Amino acid sequence: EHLLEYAPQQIDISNTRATQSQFDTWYEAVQLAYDIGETEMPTVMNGLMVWCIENGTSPNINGVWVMMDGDEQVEYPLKPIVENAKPTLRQIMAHFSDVAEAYIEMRNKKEPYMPRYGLVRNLRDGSLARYAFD
Amino acid sequence: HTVPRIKAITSKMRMPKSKGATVLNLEHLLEYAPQQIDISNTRATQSQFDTWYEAVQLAYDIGETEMPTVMNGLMVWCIENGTSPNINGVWVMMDGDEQVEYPLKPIVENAKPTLRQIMAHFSDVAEAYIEMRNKKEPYMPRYGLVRNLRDGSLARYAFDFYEVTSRTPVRAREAHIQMKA
Amino acid sequence: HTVPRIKAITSKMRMPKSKGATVLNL
């Protein structure tokens, strides 16, 4: 009587997506590392995935990621993000996979815009670009 | 009577949430559109290019308003001989017929993460320069001559530090693809 | 609006002191 009523979403119980308990830990841990309060970090995470779209999700820990204000680049250390992401950054970043395609398609209607995941692998198509991030 | 139209479906789309609050503000995403090559990783960071610019400036003991002349010939050399030379080497730049030599150790050593990514900042000017010097005599950089690039028009996309942006021609992208020939 | 830049940190650097007075003149 419970199985004929228990229908969970496939992606919620999946293993490719990191657990909701393991995403909150990564969210708060990165929040503590950057010394950025709430109601302001969403701006930082607003540009984290845009960077991760272009440059994949397996970068060097000692590196740095960039986000633009107008024309000036701002830099955030990459060590807290990769180090505090369990089991890995890709699975933690998969929570944004629903928004990434909506963002890529939004920026593909005015000029061609292909993430580097496709350019390196020679993805010779225009419409199939919103499914081309790591 | 009225034909029975199919009830349109609506794909709910899952926001990434954290303790009942979303982690993304959408009024900023619907307005945040950075240039692809600026946030890219193939091009070295603007903060990592200024360091390489000043460091090489200090190493050559050449003041400002004069170094642009030196950098005017650095990329021309780098077009012909790639961007991964020996550190202990030397690069050449001509005044008329006389060659002048600059040590290659400061340039390669102080280039982070690598010389190619630091030199990619000139990739927009290199094709404009190659095309300018290709309209009077055939002029193919050695990156193409070694790999047998059998074309004349597709020569301005044939240097080592060319960055594949979204707007390069498809023929250029494949022309980069074969790599070693 | 303006991107939230990371508050630069400043590594204090410990002078060798002796009875409240430094032993090095910089």
Author numbering:
A (entry chain Ah): 68 to 201
B (entry chain Aa): 42 to 222
C (entry chain Ar): 42 to 67
Please give the exact wording used by the authors of the publication that reports this structure.
Potyviral CP plays a role in virtually every step of the viral infection cycle, from transmission of the virion by aphids, virus assembly and disassembly, regulation of genome amplification, protein translation, to cell-to-cell and long-distance movement. CP consists of a highly conserved globular core flanked by two large extended regions with a high frequency of structural disorder. The C-terminal high intrinsic disorder region (C-IDR) is partially conserved and packaged in the lumen of the virion, supported by the helical ssRNA scaffold. Here, we show that we can control the shape, size, RNA encapsidation ability, symmetry, stability and surface functionalization of nanoparticles through structure-based design of CP from potato virus Y (PVY).
A comprehensive analysis of the cryo-EM data revealed two new filament architectures in addition to the predominant RNA-free stacked ring assembly (VLPr) that we had previously observed. In the absence of RNA in VLPr and VLPh, the C-IDR in CPr and CPh is disordered, with no traceable cryo-EM density beyond A222. In all three structures, there was no cryo-EM density for the first 41 residues of N-IDR, exposed on the outer surface of the filaments. In the absence of ssRNA, the N-IDRs adopt two slightly different conformations, as seen in CPr and CPh allowing the formation of two different types of RNA-free filaments, with the stacked octameric ring assembly being the more stable and therefore predominant form. The RNA-free filaments with stacked-ring architecture are predominant and thus represent the most stable form of CP self-assembly. In wild type VLPr filaments, the N-IDR is responsible for the axial connection of the octameric rings, with no obvious interactions between the core regions of the CPs. In RNA-free VLPs composed of wild type CP, each CP subunit is linked to four adjacent subunits, with N-IDRs acting as clutches.
